[PDB]
Amino acid sequence: QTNQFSKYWKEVDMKIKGLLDKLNKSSDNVKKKIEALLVEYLHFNNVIGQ
Prior knowledge:
1 chains, 50 residues, Dynein heavy chain, cytoplasmic
């Protein structure tokens, strides 16, 4: 409704960067959880991007 897309797009991009930095630094059990969440957060980025 507002068309905030730029602000929310950049915001989510950081979220993904966050998740990836922590992905590298994290145990193999939560590694799977974090890669799993990225698959979904990436799609958020992709749609807001579209």
